[PDB]
Amino acid sequence: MEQHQVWAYQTKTHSVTLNSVDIPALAADDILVQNQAIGINPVDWKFIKANPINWSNGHVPGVDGAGVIVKVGAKVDSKMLGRRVAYHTSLKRHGSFAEFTVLNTDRVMTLPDNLSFERAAALPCPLLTAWQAFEKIPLTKQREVLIVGFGAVNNLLTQMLNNAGYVVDLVSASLSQALAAKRGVRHLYREPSQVTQKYFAIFDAALVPSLKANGHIICIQDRRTISYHEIALGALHDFGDRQDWQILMQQGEALLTLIAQGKMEIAAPDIFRFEQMIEALDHSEQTKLKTVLTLNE
Numbered sequence: 001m002e003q004h005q006v007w008a009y010q011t012k013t014h015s016v017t018l019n020s021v022d023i024p025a026l027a028a029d030d031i032l033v034q035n036q037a038i039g040i041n042p043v044d045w046k047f048i049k050a051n052p053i054n055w056s057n058g059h060v061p062g063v064d065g066a067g068v069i070v071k072v073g074a075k076v077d078s079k080m081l082g083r084r085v086a087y088h089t090s091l092k093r094h095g096s097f098a099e100f101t102v103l104n105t106d107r108v109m110t111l112p113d114n115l116s117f118e119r120a121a122a123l124p125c126p127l128l129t130a131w132q133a134f135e136k137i138p139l140t141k142q143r144e145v146l147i148v149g150f151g152a153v154n155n156l157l158t159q160m161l162n163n164a165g166y167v168v169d170l171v172s173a174s175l176s177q178a179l180a181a182k183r184g185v186r187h188l189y190r191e192p193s194q195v196t197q198k199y200f201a202i203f204d205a206a207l208v209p210s211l212k213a214n215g216h217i218i219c220i221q222d223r224r225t226i227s228y229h230e231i232a233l234g235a236l237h238d239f240g241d242r243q244d245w246q247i248l249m250q251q252g253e254a255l256l257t258l259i260a261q262g263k264m265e266i267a268a269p270d271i272f273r274f275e276q277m278i279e280a281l282d283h284s285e286q287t288k289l290k291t292v293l294t295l296n297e
Contacts, residue, residue, distance in 0.1 A: 007097040007277050009059040014049050016061065016097065016277060023100055028075040031105050033085060037121035038096045038274070038293040039064030040284040043222040043234070048281070053091060062096030063088055063234065066111065066120035067295075076105045084111040086256070088124035090237035096121075097277065099295070106245045107237075109252040112260035120256065121292045122269040126152035127259075128252055129233045133203055133218050134160040136229040142200040142212055143167050148192070149204070150175045152266075152290050153220055157203060158183045159264050171195065182265070266290075273297050 004023045007016040026032055044061050047053070055061075066086040072078065085108040089095050094102065111120050130153050137145070143166050147154050150172040161168045162184025169187040170180060171194075180188045189195055198209075201216040211217065211226055218229045236244060258264045269292040272280035277293060284291035 004099040005274075006060045006094070006099070007062075009048065009051075009055050009057065009061055011051060011055070011057045014051070016048065016281070018275075018277070024102055026071060026073040026102060028073045029105055030073040031069050031076055031080055031103050031108070032071040033065065033067045033087065033101050033103055033108070034070045035065045035096060035099060035101055036067040036117035036295050037065065037271075038062055038295075039066075039121040039123075039125065039269075040280060040291045040293070041125045042284075043091070043125070044097075045281055045285040046222050047091060060094035060098050061091075062098070062101075063091060064121055064124045065089075065096035065101055066117045066124075067101075069108075070100075072105070080105060084113070084117070085109060086111055086120040086124050086252075088128055088233060091234055092237070099274075104245075106242055107249065109249050109256060112257050115256060115260040117296070118269060118271055118292055118294055119259070119266070122152070122266065122290050123256065123259070124252070125233060126290075127156055127255055128248065129153045129220060129231055130156035130160060131248075131251060131255060132233060133157055133220055133229070133231045134164070136218055136231070137161075137166075137201050137216055139164065139166075140200065142215075144169070144197070144199050145201045145203065146171070146195065146199045146210065147203045151288065154203070155183065155266065156264065157220075158185060169195075169199070271297075 003020040006021050008019050041063055069080050069083045072080050087103055087108040145166050146169050148171045158168055167186050170185045171189045173190050198212050200212050203218040207217050214225050216227045220231045269290045272293050274293045274295050280291050
């Protein structure tokens with residue numbers, strides 16, 4: 001009731017340690033989520049390593065989670081209580097590596113009843129990142145696009161593009177032909193040097209020779225008649241107004257529904273217990289396999 005367990009950042013050793021700290025009272029537009037599963041994203045282990053935004057010792061990392069709304073602030077609609085939600089929270093505030101997380105009420109997505117917490121927690125950062133990147137690209141008569149790398153964002157983005165009518169080629173040293181084809185890939189290149197044609201858009205100045213004039217470069221990173229687009233999902237926390245959030249969350253909900261219905265596929269995350277955060281963080285970073293923590297073990 002009064003305290004909860006958190007994984008708190010240690011600046012000296014670029015690591016997290018388990019502690020019990022007071023559960024905060026909520027602001028008027030805030031909600032308290034009881035986490036049931038916690039996503040690990042590259043940005044989390046990258047920021048743990050580099051501390052690029054000068055987190056204080058004690059800061060709780062973690063952008064992604066999923067769980068149940070158990071308390072709400074004074075101005076929050078009482079209908080939110082008890083909802084199953086997933087979220088992508090700000091890197092500047094205490095995050096998902098905790099039993100409970102404080103979120104803004106406009107910035108969570110309701111889960112389909114048949115979508116597990118563990119699957120949901122594997123989605124907010126890569127699914128919303130993929131959707132933002134997808135939405136940058138016009139649909140013209142030139143439909144050939146190149147995706148560089150395969151990972152959780154590009155898995156989802158490939159499917160979005162193929163579903164919309166784009167012809168998608170992909171660069172990946174070890175993606176199986178069978179999985180590529182399932183996801184809708186036309187040509188699978190095993191290294192960048194094999195790419196010889198030109199594309200309408202590349203999702204990744206070095207790329208310019210591979211672009212049609214007036215094409216698009218979409219940079220998806222945690223870090224002029226060609227249009228350059230930079231996707232930074234977490235920046236909506238700083239720049240998004242309430243309508244921007246409503247629109248995105250509603251689209252995220254729609255996409256979660258497609259996933260729960262089996263219409264868009266993801267590989268099952270590797271699941272660790274909350275207690276084994278350190279081993280999970282190591283696994284995520286070393287294996288690059290999507291990793292999630294569960295509290296239901």
